[PDB]
């Protein structure tokens, strides 16, 4: 399965052996990056002057003169041919020759090649990744690995813009990088060049930019220093800011000044990109004229970025036409998937889908904003590479499977099993959701409905759930010990542990359904209660980021199933044996005398939108939005302050175990 799929492919069902004795033509004329790949594949084979002919070169080189007519007349296009007597690897330009070898490398298997002819080129001019998320920026090693990944998948763009890089954004975007960070960026650029990737360095100055000569000159001085480090593509982001930086007339003038005094003065600058302050339809001004101002003032060579109809959205034909009408050029798509910086307790490992596949001519570029987990993002990145290169033939599910088999061949099935149940985002402010657990959902929904209303469940559906849980446990244990992609495993391990505990809980709950006798049921009940507590421990000790801490997995279908089956069967037990077992499904060490479950997040205890803690803690503050004690007997009332329904008051380290109130709701304690 060639990825991305070529534009034109003719196979003959007739295999050739990689020439043991070959004759290379064009080694000095062709792209050095391509020739190096070629000679890696040919090492061990002899280079003579009367063997099989292998011709490599760009349009214009002597080596591929005979094949001029076969080379497509497109940027980054190429022509590949394998048959009995010769091999031809001929790009329209140097990058086309490199991409010819990346396809050649996939055809080579077991030392054999198929007799084939390919004419290929991209449907979208700029294709790649923008590291533009909030959170821990990608490590240096992760970025080196990404750049090699892009080259293999014909992605030609890496836009560097981590929101939390202080020399990229507020306040030190005026400062050059320190020597150590500068030497790393220098290495990234060299590696990006080796893989035919345009390293685009972006700057995010709009929050405190002043529209005067001082800051303008400092922005250009920063760009000049990046240029000295090898950067040849540049971007200016004006997203997620307020104040004077949001002025469209000023933004355009600044980028036109950069164009004329910098990008037009250098001999070798490629991409110049800007991200508007209004970067999606929902948040644009209907009264105002922000986008039309940018469209008319910005020089035509400058790209404008756009995330679609909303911050998180799929790109449609109606949405791309809406924006292009206003910016007077094809939009440079910034696709906010699989980025998870607003649902950081979730991994988004599902397939890439939703984007119209007939609008290649309507977009100038397409970049994906990934997760801060670099390797885990390779599933979607690989799929975006396929989509952007050949939208007409984009196969969502087949490309998802191909990505997984490339990222972890030694345990692809195990990773597919894990990814299938780690795709949805759970409820979020954007209302953006993805499918998850689709294969087992029919059985789960029929099993639970028959269960709640006293019918009979199909034994086949029951064994499907047993099969699923068993397979989940196999995949978790195999993935935990996989040493083929250690960075990947480190990223996902907290979720893999939570994944396994879910599976184990599911099996014990199903054993509670089979029932048998009273003591066995109680054994299973106690084991489930212990597994709940173990999942709480992980949720409180792993991935303790300051936004959505903890670890959530299989949230769309499987976890709801298990929790509602446990609740139901415990209810039937209490009715049958006149018991009072606890039917709650999430462990909580604190207690409130409402049906709203308390939640623990970092050092906060909150009521879901009188309390007794499991111990005494020093108090920080309370935040209610519409009295305290240590032993339950003696209380010490406290007063509140107010703004727009924001109640609050500091406790000043006073011991607290009890809280009460009578006439959203959070208690912060010291840890
Ligand atoms: C263009 C863009 O997507 N900007 C940021 C981004 N901004 O979206 C917002 O959340 N915008 C916003 C929301 C509330 C208040 C102000 C800005 O979306 C991505 C996913 O969150 C972030 O990674 C990007 O850095
Ligand atoms: C947990 C810390 C957190 O929420 N970080 C975060 N901040 C964002 N910004 C802050 C600046 O103004 C815009 C909102 C943000 C946007 C999208 S995801 C994200 N995370
Ligand atoms: Ca050449």
Do 115 and 126 lie in one domain? The reply is no
Which residues pair with residue 559 across a beta bridge? none
Residue whose CA lies nearest to ligand 2 atom number 4: 547
Q: Which of 71, 97, 121 is the last residue of a domain?
A: 121
Q: Phi first, then psi: give them for residue 181, nearest 5 degrees.
A: -65, -35
Residue with tokens 């894990």: 418
Which residues pair with residue 200 across a beta bridge? 159, 233
Residue whose CA lies nearest to ligand 2 atom number 15: 134
Chain breaks in the chain (C to N over 2.5 A) after: 593, 609, 626, 663
Q: Are 426 and 552 in contact (CB under 8 A)?
A: yes
Query: Mind spelling out the 3-state secondary structure of 626-667?
Result: CCEECCCCCEECCCCECCCCCEEEECCCCEEEEECCCCCEEE
Pocket test for ligand 1, best of 160, 240, 273 (most atoms within 8 A of CB): 240
Which residues pair with residue 333 across a beta bridge? 306, 366
Split into its structural domains, the chain has a count of 3
Which spans in 481-557 are helix H? 486-514, 518-541
Residue whose CA lies nearest to ligand 1 atom number 14: 240
Do 150 and 94 lie in one domain? The reply is no
Give me 176's structure tokens: 């050059």
Q: How far apart are CA 247 and CA 273, in angstroms?
A: 17
Which residues pair with residue 470 across a beta bridge? none
Polymer length of the chain:
671
| Secondary structure (3-state) at 330 | coil
C-alpha of residue 127 to centroid of ligand 3, in Å = 24
Could you say which DSSP state residue 552 is in?
A: -
Residue whose CA lies nearest to ligand 2 atom number 7: 134
Q: Are 125 and 154 in contact (CB under 8 A)?
A: no
| Secondary structure (3-state) at 130 | strand
Q: Are 274 and 305 in contact (CB under 8 A)?
A: yes
Order across the sheet with 52-58: list the strands.
Answer: 8-17, 112-120, 78-82, 86-91, 52-58, 21-25, 46-47
Residue whose CA lies nearest to ligand 1 atom number 6: 311
Do 43 and 192 lie in one domain? The reply is no
Q: Which residues are annotated as a binding site?
A: 132, 163, 239, 279, 334-336, 341, 369
Torsion of Cα atoms, 335 then 341 then 343 then 348, to 10°: 50
Q: How far apart are CA 195 and CA 149, in angstroms?
A: 9
Q: Per residue in 454-482, is it b (16+ CB within 10 Å) or e — as a string?
A: eeebeeebeebbeebbeebbebbebbeeb
Q: How far apart are CA 206 and CA 233, in angstroms?
A: 19
412-420 vs 486-514: helix crossing angle, rounded to 10:
60
Alpha carbon distances (Å) from 558 to 204, 293, 416, 468: 41, 49, 16, 10
Residue whose CA lies nearest to ligand 2 atom number 14: 240
Query: Mind spelling out the 3-state secondary structure of 5-24?
Result: CCCEEEEEEEEEECCCEEEE
248-258 vs 213-228: helix crossing angle, rounded to 10:
40
Give me 380's structure tokens: 């979607």
Question: Resolution in A, one decimal?
Answer: 2.1
396-407 vs 412-420: helix crossing angle, rounded to 10:
130
Could you say which DSSP state residue 66 is in?
A: G
Do 5 and 139 lie in one domain? The reply is no
Do 112 and 132 lie in one domain? The reply is no
Residue with tokens 């087992």: 440
Could you say which DSSP state residue 211 is in?
A: S
Could you say which DSSP state residue 109 is in?
A: B
Q: Which residues are annotated as a binding site for a protein?
A: 132, 163, 239, 279, 334-336, 341, 369
Do 280 and 243 lie in one domain? The reply is yes
| Secondary structure (3-state) at 454 | coil
Q: How far apart are CA 98 and CA 108, in angstroms?
A: 16
Give me 190's structure tokens: 């060299």
Q: Phi first, then psi: give them for residue 617, nearest 5 degrees.
A: -135, 150
Query: Mind spelling out the 3-state secondary structure of 362-396?
Result: HEEEEEECCCCCCCCCHHHHHHHHHHHHCHHHCCH
Do 77 and 133 lie in one domain? The reply is no
Q: Are 539 and 587 in contact (CB under 8 A)?
A: no
Q: How far apart are CA 509 and CA 414, in angstroms?
A: 23
Do 524 and 613 lie in one domain? The reply is yes
Nearest-atom index, ligand 2, CA of 344: 1
Residue with tokens 């290495």: 187
Q: Which residues contact 271 (CB under 8 A, 6 or more apart)?
A: 126, 157, 198, 200, 233, 234, 235, 303
Q: Which residues contact 418 (CB under 8 A, 6 or more apart)?
A: 349, 472, 475, 476, 479, 492, 495, 496, 499
Q: Phi first, then psi: give them for residue 655, nearest 5 degrees.
A: -60, 135
Q: Are 278 and 284 in contact (CB under 8 A)?
A: yes
Q: Which of 407, 429, 454 is the last residue of a domain?
A: 407
Q: What was the experiment behind these coordinates?
A: X-ray
The alpha carbon of residue 552 and the mean position of all alpha carbons in its chain are separated, in whole angstroms, by 16
Q: Which residues contact 504 (CB under 8 A, 6 or more apart)?
A: 469, 473, 531
Ligand closest to Cα of 95 equals 3
Rg (CA), the chain: 29
Q: How far apart are CA 620 and CA 455, in angstroms?
A: 52
DSSP string, 239-283: -S--SGGG-HHHHHHHHHHHIIIIITTSSS---EEEE-SS-SSTT
Q: Are 319 and 354 in contact (CB under 8 A)?
A: no
SS3 content of the chain, % helix, strand, coil (to 5): 40, 20, 40
Q: How far apart are CA 4 and CA 390, in angstroms?
A: 7
Do 602 and 496 lie in one domain? The reply is yes
Q: What is the domain-level CATH number for residue 342?
A: 3.20.20.80
Q: Checking DSSP bridges between strand 78-82 and strand 86-91, what pairing results, if any?
A: antiparallel
Residue whose CA lies nearest to ligand 1 atom number 11: 240
The pocket of ion ligand 3, defined by CB under 5 A, consists of 29, 58, 61
Query: Mind spelling out the 3-state secondary structure of 385-438?
Result: HHHHHCHHHCCHHHHHHHHHHHHCHHHHHHHHHHHHCCCCCCCCCCCCCCCCCC
Alpha carbon distances (Å) from 460 to 89, 437, 607: 54, 17, 40
C-alpha of residue 511 to centroid of ligand 3, in Å = 69
Q: How far apart are CA 219 and CA 301, in angstroms?
A: 20
Alpha carbon distances (Å) from 153 to 387, 399, 544, 662: 11, 12, 34, 62
Alpha carbon distances (Å) from 200 to 95, 241, 251, 271, 334: 17, 21, 19, 7, 14
Could you say which DSSP state residue 114 is in?
A: E
Pocket test for ligand 1, best of 202, 336, 367, 371 (most atoms within 8 A of CB): 336
Nearest-atom index, ligand 1, CA of 369: 23
Q: What is the domain-level CATH number for residue 25?
A: 3.30.379.10
Q: How far apart are CA 334 and CA 189, in angstroms?
A: 22
Q: How far apart are CA 330 and CA 327, in angstroms?
A: 8
| Secondary structure (3-state) at 351 | coil
Q: Which of 61, 92, 121 is the last residue of a domain?
A: 121
C-alpha of residue 547 to centroid of ligand 2, in Å = 8
Q: Are 322 and 315 in contact (CB under 8 A)?
A: no
Q: How far apart are CA 239 and CA 197, in angstroms?
A: 24
Do 37 and 134 lie in one domain? The reply is no
C-alpha of residue 134 to centroid of ligand 2, in Å = 6
Nearest-atom index, ligand 2, CA of 546: 1
Do 163 and 111 lie in one domain? The reply is no
Ligand 2 environment, Cβ below 6 A: 134, 240, 341-342, 546-547
Q: Phi first, then psi: give them for residue 512, nearest 5 degrees.
A: -65, -25
Q: How far apart are CA 555 and CA 557, in angstroms?
A: 6
C-alpha of residue 367 to centroid of ligand 2, in Å = 20
Q: Are 110 and 89 in contact (CB under 8 A)?
A: no
Nearest-atom index, ligand 1, CA of 161: 25
Contacts made by residues 564-568, CB under 8 angstroms, sequence distance 24+: 564/448, 564/452, 565/447, 565/448, 565/451, 565/509, 565/510, 565/513, 566/509, 566/512, 566/528, 568/448, 568/451, 568/452
Ligand closest to Cα of 335 equals 1
DSSP string, 135-189: SSPPPHHHHHHHHHHHHHTT--EEEE--TT-TTTSTTGGGSPPPHHHHHHHHHHH
Residue with tokens 């400058």: 302
Which residues pair with residue 78 across a beta bridge? 91, 120
Q: How far apart are CA 394 and CA 356, in angstroms?
A: 10
Alpha carbon distances (Å) from 127 to 196, 334, 462: 12, 10, 45
Burial group, residue 330, by CB count within 10 angstroms (0-12, 13-18, 19+): buried
Provide the terminal-to-terminal Cα distance of the chain, rounded to the nearest Å: 53
Q: How far apart are CA 208 and CA 527, in angstroms?
A: 56
Give me 582's structure tokens: 């606890």
Q: How far apart are CA 462 and CA 444, in angstroms?
A: 8
Nearest-atom index, ligand 2, CA of 311: 17
C-alpha of residue 272 to centroid of ligand 3, in Å = 26
Report the candidate in 566, 606, 574 with the shortest Cα–Cα distance to residue 588. Answer: 606
Q: Which residue range(s) make up the domain with 477?
A: 408-671
Q: How far apart are CA 476 and CA 462, in angstroms?
A: 22
Q: How far apart are CA 555 and CA 612, in angstroms?
A: 29
Do 368 and 416 lie in one domain? The reply is no
Q: Which residues are catalytic?
A: 240
Q: What is the domain-level CATH number for residue 630?
A: 1.20.58.460
C-alpha of residue 59 to centroid of ligand 3, in Å = 7
Ligand 1 environment, Cβ below 6 A: 132-134, 163, 239-240, 275, 279, 307, 311, 334, 336, 339, 341-342, 369
């Amino acid at each position: 399965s060639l990825q991305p799929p070529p534009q034109q492919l003719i196979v003959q069902n007739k295999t050739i052996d990689l020439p043991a004795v070959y004759q290379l033509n064009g080694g000095e004329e062709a792209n050095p990056h391509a020739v190096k790949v070629l000679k890696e594949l040919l090492s061990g084979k002899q280079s003579s002057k009367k063997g099989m002919l292998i011709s490599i070169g760009e349009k214009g080189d002597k080596s591929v003169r005979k094949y001029s007519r076969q080379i497509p007349d497109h940027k980054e296009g190429y022509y590949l041919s394998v048959n009995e007597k010769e091999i031809v690897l001929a790009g329209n330009d140097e990058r086309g020759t490199y991409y010819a070898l990346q396809t050649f490398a996939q055809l080579l298997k077991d030392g054999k090649l198929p007799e084939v002819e390919i004419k290929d080129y991209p449907s979208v001019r700029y294709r790649g990744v923008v590291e533009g998320f909030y959170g821990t920026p990608w490590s240096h090693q992760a970025r080196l690995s990404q750049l090699k990944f892009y080259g293999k998948n014909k992605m030609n763009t890496y836009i560097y813009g981590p929101k939390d890089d202080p020399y990229h954004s507020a306040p030190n975007w005026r400062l050059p990088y320190p020597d150590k960070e500068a030497a790393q960026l220098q290495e990234l650029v060299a590696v990006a060049n080796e893989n035919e990737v345009d390293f685009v360095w972006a700057i995010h100055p709009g929050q405190d930019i002043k529209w005067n000569k001082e800051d303008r000159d400092l922005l250009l001085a920063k760009f000049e220093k990046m240029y000295q480090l090898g950067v040849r593509s540049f971007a200016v982001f004006f997203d997620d800011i307020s104040g004077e930086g949001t002025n469209p007339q000023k933004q355009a003038e600044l980028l036109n000044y950069i164009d004329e005094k910098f990008a037009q003065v250098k001999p070798d600058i490629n991409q110049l990109v800007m991200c508007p302050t209004e970067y999606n339809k929902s948040w644009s001004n209907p009264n105002g004229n922000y986008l039309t101002t940018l469209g008319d003032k910005l020089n035509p060579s400058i790209q404008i970025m756009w995330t679609g109809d909303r911050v998180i959205s799929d790109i449609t034909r109606d949405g791309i036409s809406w924006i292009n009408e206003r910016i007077k050029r094809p939009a440079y798509i910034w696709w906010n998937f699989p980025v998870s910086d607003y649902v950081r307790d979730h991994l988004l490992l599902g397939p890439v889908y939703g984007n119209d596949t007939t609008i290649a001519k309507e977009m100038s570029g397409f970049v994906t904003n990934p997760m801060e987990h670099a390797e885990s993002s390779k599933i979607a990145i690989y799929s975006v590479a396929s989509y952007a290169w050949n939208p007409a033939k984009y196969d969502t599910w087949q490309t998802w499977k191909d990505a997984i088999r490339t990222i972890l061949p030694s345990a692809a099935e195990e990773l597919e099993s894990f990814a299938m149940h780690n795709s949805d985002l759970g409820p979020n402010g954007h209302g953006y959701r993805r499918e998850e657990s689709m294969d087992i959902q029919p059985a789960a929904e029929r099993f639970l409905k028959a269960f709640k209303e006293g019918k009979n469940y199909d034994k086949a559906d029951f064994e499907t759930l047993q099969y699923t849980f068993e397979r989940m446990k196999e995949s978790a244990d195999i993935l935990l010990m996989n040493t083929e992609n250690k960075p990947l495993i480190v990223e996902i391990t907290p979720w893999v542990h939570q994944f396994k505990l879910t599976a184990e809980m599911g099996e014990e709950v199903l054993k509670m359904v089979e029932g048998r006798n009273e003591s066995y049921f109680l054994r299973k009940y106690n084991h489930v209660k212990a597994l709940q507590q173990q999942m709480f421990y992980i949720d409180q000790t792993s991935n303790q980021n300051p936004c959505q801490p903890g670890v959530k997995t299989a949230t769309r279908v499987i976890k709801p199933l298990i929790d509602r089956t446990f609740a139901t069967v415990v209810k039937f037990f209490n009715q049958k044996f006149n018991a009072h077992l606890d039917a709650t499904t999430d462990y909580m060490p604190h207690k409130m005398i409402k049906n709203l479950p308390l939640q623990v997040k970092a050092n906060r205890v909150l009521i879901s939108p009188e309390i007794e803690l499991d111990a005494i803690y020093p108090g920080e503050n309370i935040q209610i939005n519409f009295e305290i004690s240590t032993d339950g007997k003696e209380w010490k009332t406290v007063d509140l302050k107010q703004k727009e329904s924001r109640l609050s008051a500091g406790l000043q380290k006073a011991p607290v175990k009890f809280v009460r109130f009578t006439n959203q709701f959070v208690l912060t304690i010291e840890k």
